[PDB]
Design an enzyme around this catalytic site. Structure first.
Site: not given
Length: 294
Positions: A15, A123, A125, A128
């Site tokens: 973001y 999300d 992955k 993160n």
């Protein structure tokens, strides 16, 4: 904000820019994330506020939600490195199995917690999943996807990776279940073991077909209702499933058994985080200290 001194840029987030910063009052170092304009929809604000309450040892703590001058800043607990960098750094030798098991075990504890509160990541992955020098691993950005939909590209035009995306998402399912997170974690589990991404797709159809060539093209037998999904096409090629002994050597039988359950096509058949924690694979789980050189 004025209450934080930006130490340095941690990287580009989904973001917005991510900075390492110091609170000029508590003196603590944190991770400041700017979220990218009308006035921030109250829906996002309420959602994020709820996130300040789901605290768990394996979830990166959301310290504060700063909404000022009609802009959003999320202040998170700071961790020195992510799993992606750690995996890359351990390419030549690979992460020791004991540490892989410990990480998967902790990650599942994190998912079980959030999933019990009906909160999913959507999300997951390597990028993160954050680790510290004490052997801990934590899930970052949990619950943000629902607050801010996951874009195709980031503000920097970087392509958001599809490698860990569950098949039901790729096939157009508009409603996500906690099973999407288990799928992602299964893909990550396989990657830590083999030192290579399981399904490195570079487009939605390429991602879907890579899954199909390994797990076999799904049908009504293994996935009831699959042929009626939005993006399903009767014209999808028909590939036969490969044996896991070939997919993830040298993972033992317990590991392969658990991975298979985390990668089940039918979201409803896919193992839950809670049930996975009881799997025989974790019988001898320990908490090794990873060797990090910051």
């Amino acid at each position: 904000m004025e209450n934080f001194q930006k130490v340095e840029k941690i990287g580009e987030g989904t973001y917005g820019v991510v900075y390492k910063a110091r609170n000029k009052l508590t003196g603590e170092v944190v991770a400041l994330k700017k979220i990218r304009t009308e006035g921030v929809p109250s829906t996002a604000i309420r959602e994020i506020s709820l996130l300040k309450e789901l605290n768990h040892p394996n979830i990166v703590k959301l310290l504060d939600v700063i909404h000022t001058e009609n802009k959003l800043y999320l202040v998170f607990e700071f961790l020195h490195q992510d799993l992606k960098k750690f995996m890359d750094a351990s390419a030549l030798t690979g992460i020791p199995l004991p540490l892989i098991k410990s990480y998967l075990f902790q990650l599942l504890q994190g998912l079980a917690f959030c999933h019990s509160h009906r909160v999913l990541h959507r999300d997951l992955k390597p990028q993160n999943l954050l680790i510290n020098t004490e052997g801990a691993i934590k899930l970052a950005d949990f619950g943000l996807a629902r607050a801010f939909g996951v874009p195709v590209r980031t503000y920097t035009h970087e392509v958001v990776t599809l490698w860990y995306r569950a098949p039901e998402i790729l096939l157009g399912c508009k409603y996500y279940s906690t099973a999407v997170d288990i799928w992602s974690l299964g893909c990550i589990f396989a990657e830590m073991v083999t030192r290579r991404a399981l399904f490195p797709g570079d487009s939605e159809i390429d991602q879907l077909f890579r899954i199909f060539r390994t797990l076999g093209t799904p049908d009504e037998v293994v996935w009831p209702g699959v042929t009626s999904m939005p993006d399903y096409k009767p014209s999808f090629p028909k590939w036969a499933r490969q044996d896991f002994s070939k997919v993830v050597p040298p993972l033992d039988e317990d590991g392969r058994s658990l991975l298979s359950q985390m990668l089940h096509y039918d979201p409803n058949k896919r193992i839950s985080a809670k049930a996975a924690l009881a799997h025989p694979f974790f019988q001898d789980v320990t908490k090794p200290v990873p060797h990090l050189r910051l």
